[PDB]
Structures are given as C-alpha cells and as structure tokens.
Design a protein around this nucleic acid. Structure first.
Ligand SMILES: [Mg+2]
Ligand SMILES: [Mg+2]
Ligand SMILES: [Mg+2]
Ligand SMILES: [Mg+2]
Ligand SMILES: [Mg+2]
Ligand SMILES: [Mg+2]
Ligand SMILES: [Mg+2]
Ligand SMILES: [Mg+2]
Ligand SMILES: [Mg+2]
Ligand SMILES: [Mg+2]
Ligand SMILES: [Mg+2]
Ligand SMILES: [Mg+2]
Ligand SMILES: [Mg+2]
Ligand SMILES: [Mg+2]
Ligand SMILES: [Mg+2]
Ligand SMILES: [Mg+2]
Ligand SMILES: [Mg+2]
Ligand SMILES: [Mg+2]
Ligand SMILES: [Mg+2]
Ligand SMILES: [Mg+2]
Ligand SMILES: [Mg+2]
Ligand SMILES: [Mg+2]
Ligand SMILES: [Mg+2]
Ligand SMILES: [Mg+2]
Ligand SMILES: [Mg+2]
Ligand SMILES: [Mg+2]
Ligand SMILES: [Mg+2]
Ligand SMILES: [Mg+2]
Ligand SMILES: [Mg+2]
Ligand SMILES: [Mg+2]
Ligand SMILES: [Mg+2]
Ligand SMILES: [Zn+2]
Ligand SMILES: [Zn+2]
Lengths: 48, 178, 116, 71, 57, 134
RNA sequence: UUACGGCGGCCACAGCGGCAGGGAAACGCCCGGUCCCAUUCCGAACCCGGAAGCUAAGCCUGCCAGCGCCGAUGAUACUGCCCCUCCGGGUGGAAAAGUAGGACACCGCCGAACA
RNA sequence: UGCCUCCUAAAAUGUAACGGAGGCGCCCAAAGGUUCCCUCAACCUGGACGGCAAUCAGGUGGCGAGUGUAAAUGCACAAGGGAGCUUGACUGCGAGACUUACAAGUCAAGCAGGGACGAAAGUCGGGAUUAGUGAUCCGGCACCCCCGAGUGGAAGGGGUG
RNA sequence: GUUGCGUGGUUCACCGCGGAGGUAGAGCUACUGGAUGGCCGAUGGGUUACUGACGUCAGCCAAACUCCGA
C-alpha cells in the first residue's frame, strides 16, 4: 500500500533518494526537485 | 445615490434624535449590515446547492454569497463534517441601502398573505430577524428557471442598543409592523 | 477598540521572534491615520537610542502625500541612526502589514543607508 | 495486564548555578514543561540544551518556567 | 474580489401600475420591471349567528 | 448502600492510620455516634444499625448516615493457589477513623434517643460513644 | 517639571466590574474607494487620499471591596533523628484550610505642549 | 514473550509480581517547509422548513474545544483553524552532551555547497513530543572504476547508496 | 575484594548559599469522578403527594483527582 520508492536524477539517472508514498493516493510517478550530489545542484527527480 | 440612505440622513436621524435624547450626534441608531442565508437541507443528499443557492442569491442581492460548510457531524440529520449546508451573504453600504429599499418597496408586500412583519422578533440587543419560506417574490428571479423551491432569512443589524430603538428605526425606515 | 486589540495581538505575535539588540536595534513603527512614528528601542534595557515621527518641519515640507511624508521621515530616522552610530537594525512591522506607507518608510531607510 | 514500556530517564540534568559547556543537555522532557530562555535551544524533542558556556538560571516569564544560561 | 464573480449590478427603474416609480441599481436584468402592486397600493399600508338568524327569520 | 459507579473497580486498601480531620462533630441532628477506632464498616453493618435505630424509635425523629461505603474490597475464589491475578470485588466498605461521626439522630425523648444509639453502636465492629450537640 | 502619545519592565496586591471628569499637540472615532492592497461574499477587515463632525466609544485621570486576587501570627496535620514494647514523648523542621489584614498597581526610555 | 503511555513507585533517576489500565507492527505528497491571518467548546436571546441539536445574527465565554492515531506531558504567545508559494521528507560534516554492562538508542549549536519561503530578521537535515520495528552472516540492484593470479581484457572481488 | 603503577583530597561528614519536585498532609464552587441532607424544580407518571435533572445551601470521599503542599 505504501511501498518504498526510489528517485533518480532526471539528468544523470543516478538514484539518490528512497522514500515512501501511497500507491492509491498517487498512482502516477512522483516528481520532486532534489539536490543531486553528482550534478552539483538541484535537479528534477522522478520515480523509477 | 441611494435614495433610502438620503432619506435616512435627511430626516430619520433627526427623528431618532427627537425620540431619544442622545447627548452626542453619533449615539443615533444606524443599520450596520443586512445578512441573508440559506441553511439548505440538501447537504447530505444530491449535494447540489451551488446552482440551488448561489445562483439565485447572487442575482437577488447583488454580490455572490459565501459558502458555509458543516461545523460538525450529526447522524440524525445525516450530517457529516466538511460539506456545505448553508450559503450566507452580507450586504453593507449603498448595496445594503438599495437592497433594503427594494425589499420594503416591492418585495415584502408582494408575498402571499402579507399581514405585516411581527414587531416582537428582535434579538433583545437592537437587531431584527425574519425569514420567508420559499423562492421569494423578487422580480430578479423568475419561476421559469428555478429548481426545487427554497426560502431564506434576513438578519438586519443596527447600531441601536435597545429593542425599542431598533423597532423605531425599522418603523421610520419603512418596515410594516403590527 | 477591537482594531487596537487585534493590532496589539499581531504585534506581540511578530515580536515573539524579534527582539533587537544594542548593535542591531529594533526599527519599530507606530502609524496613525494622521501621522506615523518610528524609534530604535534596543530591547535589552528598554533604552531608546533614536526616534522620529511625522510631526516636525516635514509636516509642512510635504512633496505629495502621506507616502511622501513617510519617505521623508525615513530619511530623517536614517540620518539620526547614522549620527548615533547604528548601521544594522531589525525592522518591526508594529503589527501592521508591510506595504504602502510602511514600505515607503522601509525602503527610504534602506537606500538612505541602513543595512536591514 | 502485565505490559509496560521502558523508563525514559526524563527530568532536569543540570541544576541552577551549575557551570556547563556549550551543547550540554539540561532538561529531558515531553513537551515544554520548561521553556527555553536566553542561550538555550529546544531540540527536536524538547531537550533544552545550552547554546553557550555559562551557569544555569531558572526563572519565570509570565507563566512559563524558563531555563537560561548566563555567561 | 470583484472581477468576474459578482453578478452585474447596473442602474434600473421600477414602474408600477399605481404610479410609484423609483430608480435603483438591480441585477442582470438591465431593462425595466413591470409590477402591479407597490408599497403605496398594497393592503396593510393603507388599511354573528344571532344576526344571521334575525335576517333569516 | 452501593455506589452507582466507580472509576476503578480494583483499588488498594484504604490506609488505616491517623485521626479523622473532617466530619468530627454533629452537624445535621442533635445526637450522634462518634467512632474511637479504625475499621472497614460495610453496607451490611450500616443497614443493620440503621434498621436497629429505626425499629427502636418506631415513629418520629430523623436519622442521618454521614458515611457511604464506596471503597471496594476483593476476594479470590475459595479453592485457589497463590497469585494468579487479583480477585473480583466482593464487599463495599467505608473507611472510618477515630473521631468520625457515623450517625446523626434527632428525637424529642433523650432517653429513647440514647437507647436507640446504643443499640446501633452494639451492632458495629468498633468502640463508639454518644456525643451531643453541646 | 505638569499631564498627554508611544516603547518596554512585571503578568491580578496589577484583573473584571461600577461611578464621575478630557480631546492643545496627540491617540481614536469618522469621509470616500481614484491610485497600492483585499474580502473562502462584503473598502466589515486590511490598504490608499483626508480632516465635515466628536469625546458618545476606545484611551487617560480620580473614587469604589462589589466579584476576583494576595495574605499573616498562633495552633494543628504531617515529618527527619532519637527514647520507647505499643501507647506516646524529646529534639529539629512545618503546612493546606481558616482568621486578622492588604489591595482599584508599581518601575524605566523616547517624543509633543507645557519647561 | 518485542516496542509506546499511566499507576503501583515512597515529591531527582531507577525499582518486582501469572499487580491495576490502555495502545503499536501505522498514517499523511500533505496531516511536510515557510509567510501571513484568525480564535474554540458550551450557554442565553431572536430567526421558514429547523425540532435538544443543520446554517444566520447579537451577547456571555481564557480554555472547560481541538491535536491523524493509546495515555502522559504540552500547546489560547497557540503546537488549534484558514489561505499563498514550495520540496530541507537535502548533500559533506559536526564541537559538546543524555542514556548506557556491551551492542545499541537520543539531542545538538554551528561550518560549507546547493535551495524553499520571507521585503528583511530569519526558519527549514519530515510530522507538538514520546510507539509504527529486526543485529550479524549470506545474497540482489544502481553508481565509482579501487584489485585484476605471465601480459591485455574478462570472470570474480572492493567501496558508496 | 585484593594487588602493581599513576593522581592526590578530587571521596565522605557538618555549616552556609543556588536549584527541580508533587509523596505525607490537605483541599475540591480549582478539574475529573464518587457521595449525605435540604431549597428550587428539568423530564418522565394517572389535573402531578410518584423519578427528581441543573444549580444552590451545609457536610463529605479518591493509587491512576490536584487550586495547593511539607
Ligand atoms: Mg492528494
Ligand atoms: Mg513509563
Ligand atoms: Mg521527529
Ligand atoms: Mg478533608
Ligand atoms: Mg461495638
Ligand atoms: Mg485636541
Ligand atoms: Mg469603507
Ligand atoms: Mg473617545
Ligand atoms: Mg466620555
Ligand atoms: Mg504559619
Ligand atoms: Mg492558607
Ligand atoms: Mg482589583
Ligand atoms: Mg514514579
Ligand atoms: Mg520518581
Ligand atoms: Mg495488545
Ligand atoms: Mg502542521
Ligand atoms: Mg503550507
Ligand atoms: Mg495550526
Ligand atoms: Mg525519509
Ligand atoms: Mg559528533
Ligand atoms: Mg547555501
Ligand atoms: Mg539547523
Ligand atoms: Mg504523532
Ligand atoms: Mg551464522
Ligand atoms: Mg591476468
Ligand atoms: Mg565487476
Ligand atoms: Mg524543597
Ligand atoms: Mg501523580
Ligand atoms: Mg492522602
Ligand atoms: Mg471534586
Ligand atoms: Mg494525591
Ligand atoms: Zn544528477
Ligand atoms: Zn403600486
């Protein structure tokens, strides 16, 4: 119901963050802006 | 310019001053606001009052009303928290003046079996309340495009501190009492 | 009455997180329908170090309206603060919303030298 | 019956007049039974640590019991 | 907020069969309103068994 | 004499020490019974004493009972080994300390009143005396 | 310095309430919504330009124990340590409640008229 | 049978029982962050349906409501209610502490990068706080290109998550 | 506990000073509950002698009550 999801940088595709969400409440892929250590700044992240 | 407001400022203020010996000019009673609300019962059933209440109150008054949602949950009324049960608007200033003038002129005499507003429905502080029970006779709304019938209530709030002063102010403004 | 109470409520709420020290005093404001007032408090001993208002020669030295008067008194209080030896302060809304006369006061002081 | 939870070792850790170092925990508590004063932070779980070296000082701030550090 | 929310409130004029006519600002109807009774003409604003047996017999 | 409700069915035994600080004088009637020793007076004992007073006076007068048995006492089943959970409530008891006035009585005849109070006292598990309203 | 407008200290001995007096500067009430800004609707509020009118209100001053608040001394409850077989006693602390009473605040900085 | 809350528990901490009561093995993409604004329940009076109790108006009301969820401690200065913008529900650290047999657990100012909100001061390393969890071994996956059994690769291993 | 090597009064006792408390007790119109007797009377009962709510006047009780408080 609340699985563990991973967020990858939209640019370098590196997996940087893991978290949870409600599958029914957000049936589509989560989108967030998070700091990417590899890119050196904040980039958009999407579920994998 | 609101003719009822002009008539008030011309003679009603002096009349109230004669009736009650106020020591200062701003101790004279004055109407503050007029509030009209629905309080519909179709909140738990069919939930369609935006067209049932707002669309008519806006044209009746002159401003779109505010939606009031349930403050609690009642099983007996099938009342849940969070859905609208009533729609309230308040009229102030020249809009209130025009609304009161139009009411007292053409709307109040024009309902079924108009025998006059009871002068005993005051709240004890100087503000009056009365309400109808159907789609009012306002010429702004016609039967040809209305849903199920619903009535409304008016709260008129005055600067008066006593029921007698409020009644005198309403009588001078033109409220037909017994 | 109720306006006074609500203004005091809002001022206390904002002051909960905002004190102002000797080195960084409090740019407090006090606006009326006819005038405004401003002073630096240094909320460590309750000792005002600089003050200004709209009742001075500026009450007739008016190039416009209440906003122009607020600009002028902002320049005046900035000069008073520089004379005192103050270059960093904390702006206190006084419970009024930021903008208008208050904004004119604030930015007048800002480009007149205060670093807040 | 028969169940229980661990004792959490709450309470005052440093008392009035004690000399403390920066960051020393002073009061472990649930909620703000005491309130942070000058040179005293709160912490994510109402922990009332010391932000500076000094001596502890308990006081009153119009109803709230406060803990402060004097340098 | 009065941009598109509130209904139109424009000057109007009330014409009554009695003759009592005044002009105010009303809602979406911009034209006239035709009425047959006003405050100046409506009622309430301008104001035996033994006898039946006697007239029967 | 049973309470309508209690918040805690199983409670620790009331502590039997000290002198009563409240209700040490007659307040309602003009005659009373004052306790001299600690005890756990039960509703059965209270009912016995009340019926004794009432059935001796047989008419007239008023009797007040300024104690209520609202403290429960539990008892385990008769045939059980030690320590398998606290027992279920069995008795309702009032905690009485020396100096506490138990009963209040008013009657036109002092002799009959005193006789009825003595009859009540002999039914209670305490040493009790009779005190007046001065 | 007098008595006013702010900012604070303190958070009822300071509060609530009642009774009187004030509008120089000021503080407000107040006039409109053209401009900034805003109403889960309303220029009611906030914000904007002002002084036609006014202390009626807020506010300030003085007087009220009315509700509320503070509160002894003494005594008692309780109690550390000894004596003592319990009873109780010695010695050192000491309430709560109640009573007498107190109390319609006090203190600092800035500004205006007056100084 | 593990974890959280109260009483027992004797006014620091800690303290047993097959002692007395309850909860947890989650939930929320907003119920998180930030900026700004507001005050509740109850009672009284008046008002078509509407009545004890729906929405409305006016008084009284300082916390007697409310808090995602047990209880405790807190919160009206709001931590309660409403709205706008957002993702800090970050990365590299961390002086110094609480607790503690050990293993664990807990708090933390502040520095830098890159950001959110705010005019600024500032606040922000999830949630008013305390439960919602499982050591080591052995494996899987993504990335770095650290070792690479003659050499160059590769297999396999290694580090980070 | 003992013992080797370090440290040396840091331990402990009494006196003074600065601190947090909620036990004993007490109180409860200061909350949450229990509870005696009156006054008033909410409802229910067949015009009400019957249940007698809420308050209020006195007297009370509590490990999971505390305006207090050793
Ligand atoms: Mg959603
Ligand atoms: Mg515990
Ligand atoms: Mg947390
Ligand atoms: Mg007692
Ligand atoms: Mg006997
Ligand atoms: Mg003047
Ligand atoms: Mg306006
Ligand atoms: Mg005034
Ligand atoms: Mg006056
Ligand atoms: Mg004494
Ligand atoms: Mg006392
Ligand atoms: Mg007083
Ligand atoms: Mg304990
Ligand atoms: Mg303890
Ligand atoms: Mg269970
Ligand atoms: Mg929140
Ligand atoms: Mg938000
Ligand atoms: Mg909130
Ligand atoms: Mg996370
Ligand atoms: Mg560290
Ligand atoms: Mg940065
Ligand atoms: Mg930080
Ligand atoms: Mg939680
Ligand atoms: Mg193994
Ligand atoms: Mg090779
Ligand atoms: Mg490989
Ligand atoms: Mg002590
Ligand atoms: Mg306790
Ligand atoms: Mg006790
Ligand atoms: Mg009680
Ligand atoms: Mg107790
Ligand atoms: Zn990247
Ligand atoms: Zn007509």
């Amino acid at each position: 119901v609340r699985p563990k999801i991973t967020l990858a940088c939209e640019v370098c595709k590196h997996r940087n963050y893991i978290t949870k969400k409600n599958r029914r409440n957000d049936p589509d892929r989560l989108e967030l802006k998070k700091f990417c250590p590899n890119c050196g700044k904040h980039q958009a992240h999407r579920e994998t | 310019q609101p003719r009822l407001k002009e008539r008030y400022r011309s003679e009603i203020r002096d009349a109230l001053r004669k009736q009650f010996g106020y020591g200062n000019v701003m101790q004279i009673p004055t109407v503050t606001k007029v509030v009209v609300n629905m309080g519909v019962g179709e909140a738990a059933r069919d939930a369609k009052l935006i067209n049932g209440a707002v669309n008519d109150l806006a044209l009746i008054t002159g401003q779109k009303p505010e939606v009031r949602r349930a403050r609690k949950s009642i099983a007996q009324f099938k009342l849940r928290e969070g859905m609208p049960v009533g729609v309230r608007v308040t009229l102030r200033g020249d809009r209130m003046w025009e609304f009161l003038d139009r009411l007292t002129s053409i709307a109040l005499p024009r309902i079924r079996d108009f025998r006059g507003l009871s002068p005993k429905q005051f709240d004890g502080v100087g503000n009056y309340t009365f309400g109808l029970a159907e789609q009012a006779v306002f010429h702004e709304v016609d039967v040809d495009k209305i849903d199920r019938v619903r009535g409304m209530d008016i709260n008129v709030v005055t600067s008066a501190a006593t029921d007698d002063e409020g009644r005198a102010l309403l009588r001078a403004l033109g409220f037909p009492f017994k | 009455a109720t306006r006074r109470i609500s203004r005091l409520r809002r001022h206390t709420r904002l002051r909960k997180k905002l004190s102002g020290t000797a080195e960084r005093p409090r740019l407090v404001v006090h606006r009326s329908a006819r005038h405004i007032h401003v002073q630096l408090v240094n909320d460590l001993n309750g000792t005002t170090v600089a003050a200004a208002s709209s009742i001075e020669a500026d009450v007739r030295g008016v190039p416009g309206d209440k906003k122009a008067r607020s600009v002028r008194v902002g320049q005046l209080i900035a000069e008073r603060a520089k004379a005192a030896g103050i270059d960093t302060v904390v702006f206190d809304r006084g419970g009024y919303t930021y903008g208008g006369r208050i904004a004119a006061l604030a930015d007048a002081a800002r480009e007149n030298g205060l670093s807040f | 019956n028969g169940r229980d939870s661990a004792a959490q070792r709450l309470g005052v850790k440093r008392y009035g007049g004690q000399v403390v170092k920066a960051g020393e925990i002073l009061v472990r508590q649930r909620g703000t039974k005491f309130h942070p004063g000058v040179n005293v932070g709160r912490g994510g779980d109402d922990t009332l640590f010391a932000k500076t070296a000094g001596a502890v000082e308990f006081g009153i701030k119009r109803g709230r019991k406060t803990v402060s550090i004097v340098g | 907020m009065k941009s598109d929310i509130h209904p139109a409130y424009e000057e109007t004029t009330v014409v009554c069969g009695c003759g009592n006519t005044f002009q105010t600002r009303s809602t979406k109807p911009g034209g006239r309103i035709v009425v047959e009774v006003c405050s100046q003409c409506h009622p309430f604003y301008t104001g035996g068994r033994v006898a039946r047996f006697e007239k029967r017999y | 004499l049973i309470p309508r409700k209690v918040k805690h069915r199983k409670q620790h035994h009331p502590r039997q020490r000290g002198i009563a600080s409240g209700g040490t004088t007659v307040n309602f009637g003009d005659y009373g019974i004052q306790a001299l020793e600690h005890a756990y007076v039960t509703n059965r004992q209270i009912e016995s004493a009340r019926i004794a007073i009432n059935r001796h006076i047989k008419r007239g007068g008023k009797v007040w009972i300024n104690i209520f048995p609202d403290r429960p006492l539990t008892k385990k089943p008769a045939e059980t080994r030690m320590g398998s959970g606290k027992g279920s409530p069995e008795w309702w008891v009032a905690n009485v300390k020396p100096g506490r006035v138990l009963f209040e009585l008013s009657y036109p005849n002092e002799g009959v009143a005193r006789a009825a109070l003595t009859r009540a006292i002999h039914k209670l598990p305490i040493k009790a005396r009779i005190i007046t309203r001065e």
